[PDB]
Amino acid sequence: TEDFIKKQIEEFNIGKRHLANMMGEDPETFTQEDIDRAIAYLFPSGLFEKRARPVMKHPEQIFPRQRAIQWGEDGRPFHYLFYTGKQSYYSLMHDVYGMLLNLEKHQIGSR
């Protein structure tokens, strides 16, 4: 849930400060890349898969968005097309339809 994600955000920030202190790097200027380097050094792992190795990232990157429940505390879904089951897909379809209507009213490099 959103509160859980916020708690993970705080925990990750605190762990980032711990890592910055451990490596002696200025926590204020301590970046994600620096965190990456330090964690790699501190937890030497020899797995071939980049996914099977340890990780300490922001919760945003870490967790799967898992579609974010889609209904707030009240229980009202956020997306008006929510009950379709493919809310983002149908939102994009609706947007493209609107753009096509607008264009209709007015009037070897890629793939």
Next chain:
Amino acid sequence: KHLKFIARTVMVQEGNVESAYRTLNRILTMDGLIEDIKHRRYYEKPCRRRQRESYERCRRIYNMEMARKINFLMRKNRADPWQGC
């Protein structure tokens, strides 16, 4: 006892006997004479004739209805006017 050459006679046009014969055979088929000849080569018992005629009428009506339905619904084949939805 009728006059000769007045019945089922077609004058060949410019000697295209092939075309004239094709026209004559078309005439015979349209009037059903070929049907009669090839059916009368043997005797169809009255029960079989009744069954065959009923089947032919049913198939004719079914085909007419199917063709009418297909023609009626063909107009909807036009490209989708609301594509993307």
